[PDB]
Amino acid sequence: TIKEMPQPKTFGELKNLPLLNTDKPVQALMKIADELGEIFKFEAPGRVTRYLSSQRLIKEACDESRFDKNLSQALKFVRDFAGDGLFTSWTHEKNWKKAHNILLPSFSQQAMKGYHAMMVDIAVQLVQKWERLNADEHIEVPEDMTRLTLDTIGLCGFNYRFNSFYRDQPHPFITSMVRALDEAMNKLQRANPDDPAYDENKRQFQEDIKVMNDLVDKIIADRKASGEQSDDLLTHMLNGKDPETGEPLDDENIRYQIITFLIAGHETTSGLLSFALYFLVKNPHVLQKAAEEAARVLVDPVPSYKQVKQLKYVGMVLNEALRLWPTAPAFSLYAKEDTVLGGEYPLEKGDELMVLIPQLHRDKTIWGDDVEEFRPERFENPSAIPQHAFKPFGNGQRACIGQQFACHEATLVLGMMLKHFDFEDHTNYELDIKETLTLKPEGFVVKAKSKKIPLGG
Amino acid sequence: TIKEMPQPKTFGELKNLPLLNTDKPVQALMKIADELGEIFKFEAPGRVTRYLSSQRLIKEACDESRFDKNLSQALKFVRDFAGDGLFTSWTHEKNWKKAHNILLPSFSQQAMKGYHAMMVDIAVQLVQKWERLNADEHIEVPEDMTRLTLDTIGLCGFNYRFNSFYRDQPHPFITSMVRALDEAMNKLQRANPDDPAYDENKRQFQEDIKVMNDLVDKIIADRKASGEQSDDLLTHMLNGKDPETGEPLDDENIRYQIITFLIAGHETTSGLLSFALYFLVKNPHVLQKAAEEAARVLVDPVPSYKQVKQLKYVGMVLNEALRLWPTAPAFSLYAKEDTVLGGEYPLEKGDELMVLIPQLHRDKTIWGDDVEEFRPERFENPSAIPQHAFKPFGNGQRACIGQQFACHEATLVLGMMLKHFDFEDHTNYELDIKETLTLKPEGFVVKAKSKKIPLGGIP
Ligand code: HEM
Ligand code: HEM
């Protein structure tokens, strides 16, 4: 029963494009979704996409027999520095399935047990930072989460120490990364990207790409210098062979993959931890239930791998934070062939879709009327949640490769934070979500009061 | 018989003032002493002093029945920020005696045992930093020594965490202290200090004093707005009573003492550790001997107080570094009465002397013809070194109140460094000594290779 698709307001020949001229475009799209419903058409000069918000349509978009992963505009601009790495490659690119087969073992259960001590190393650094604050002081939450998550992927992935906790400024890599993502986001609104008004933006972009590549050079030269048997992600990038084609990755792809894993392997986990902590401080009964679980399970001076796997409620906290503010908040798909979506919306081969993950997660037919409430108990019975209703890690063969890594890291760190400190929302912080493609609270600060529980090596 | 002392080149009414013209004045004066010998006169508008370089004259200068501590012109400029704190007070000022009696308990044996655990906390942070460096990186030595020494006095003295190891740039207290010390030093070489052309200097000096004073306020607030009472130097400043007068220190003097202990309680110790590591990387046999002592003695995951006291050779290394580059490189005396120095130099009451410590420490009649060589064995038995030949901590009742604190800190940290790493002078560093009144190597860099010995939790 062919329906006509809704569409937000237009700007003459620019069509919908100026609706993206904002530093909060995903948030602006959620508002549009609220007015127009489960699907809307979005036009720009030479381009059309459809934004999906209901589980009813997204479950169809998630059928890999009908839709493949698409590079959204955001990912095409990101590709300028991440190339054909795993996040920004098409599914049919030879380097996609190649990298995937080679690197998949680095996220096995045996690898995870292996990473756990390194994760603990960095989590201790966070805890001791906060134990060593004086009575004035407060904590800058997303800044410290970025220190922890970047350092964790550096050490676990590459045996490389960013030493973020030794700098009172952001690490230079972070400064260039952030500016690069922000440039990619700002580029989304540009009708004429080659106008001279943007020459300065382009110069800065190339400088940031260079800083990122200077750091990759040191990661690689440090590994050749030592040689010593790490068996980590970087070992597999340099040595591993694809069981299908027999080939290793080439040098150019390796570099893209290092960049890829440094960024995707940390930015969104920093966001998650930041949002989790925000929700916990604003929902003191949930904070208490979470802290009780941490105190009952984490009975040794440092957490074991087994003990992290026992933090069920902490996991539920993290899932509910991902429900409300999934930190990579969209993914894109293209129609393999002419098809009809939902019995109502005809699509032509190649047509593009955008899944608005935060809206999917507010679908009242799935989650009920109180979709804004922070309630981790929504995840008491994960097997009862409808298929394709909860997608913070994407879909199918193109789903997040580091999902278990990120969940383990965040569960360990959050568990230790709740074991070691009581937290005060001392400014009565008002949520301000900064967008850099990814989502993070900006300006979130708290005070921690040490419970004075001794920590271990 | 009675002699006339030499004097270097004078420039009319400016006297010797234009002679220096350098950011390395102590190094210059050491060269003048090489030329002119054990004693020379040095004059500037409105002041005269006499630079002493030999043990035979300095042993008389150190007789406290004949000479008391003088505020050199340097210290008089330091006094513009440090007031009548212990370092910049006259021996006869009521505030010297009061603070001396009130703070001296903070350097008791039982106090020192109490500091050990907090010194270990900071030293563990140092070692952890160096363990976490990547293969391509290097260590900036005086920068990290300053992070360690500042943090140690902050914690032990005031229960305050500077958190220097969580910072890229130096703490702003350091930046402002360095500019203030540098201003004091430069004022010494300034013809017409009150020619309005130096108003920008005085603006900057006042701004740096304010920064140092804003930190003092945070330390006192943190102590007052914090119930968990300690028993440290600040506790005695805020509450202690002078047994003689029965009076506590007033608020103005307390503030001067905090500034004074934060500066004197770290800067020179930083210098010492930097010079000591410099001399170890230039003398591999000495390095190896010190490393072997550290391995043999430091057998536990963290050092105990008793273990630090068994590190004899490490202490000898530190003393030999102090011989060659004592980091507070002069002290001043005045004549209590008319007297004859060394049976040849008549002095009237009030006449000033300057002990040029690096030159004293190079007196060939005491140490031999090899005085420039780094040889810690000179200090195997320090009772067999003549009286007043070795004075890096000053003299008598005005000697360093923190000498044991400094020696224990530096011994601990050097021991742990030697236990945990091999060191490489990877740039073949050429010694460059920065002067800010005090002395420090500038630009000194090494590479450390971990010996991969685990470190224990902080005690
Ligand atoms: C809270 C943490 C994280 C979230 C919310 C997240 C989310 C996602 C999403 C939504 C995708 C799908 C992208 C698309 O379809 O366009 C994805 C893919 C990916 N993620 Fe994550 N992720 C997280 C953590 C990590 C970590 C820790 C790593 C690496 C250590 C990582 C590596 C990747 C990679 C390589 C891909 C591309 C996979 C492929 O297509 O072969 N992610 N992730
Ligand atoms: C290697 C390290 C050190 C050296 C070379 C050093 C050297 C000296 C010297 C030469 C003096 C006498 C100054 C004069 O006569 O004008 C002095 C006094 C002083 N030192 Fe140190 N010192 C060091 C470490 C420390 C430490 C760690 C502290 C504090 C914890 C400290 C506190 C002081 C104080 C307060 C005075 C003035 C004492 C008085 O006259 O009552 N020193 N020091």
Ligand SMILES: CCCCCCCCCCCCCCCC(=O)NCC(=O)O
């Ligand atoms: C190299 C690994 C870096 C991974 C980057 C992570 C970004 C993931 C989220 C991208 C979502 C962007 C959504 C922005 C608004 C939007 O609707 N864009 C449409 C479009 O880009 O075509």
Ligand SMILES: CCCCCCCCCCCCCCCC(=O)NCC(=O)O
């Ligand atoms: C408040 C804490 C004290 C901090 C400062 C300690 C300084 C200790 C060393 C002082 C050395 C003074 C050297 C003066 C040499 C010099 O430049 N003479 C020339 C002149 O007097 O004109």
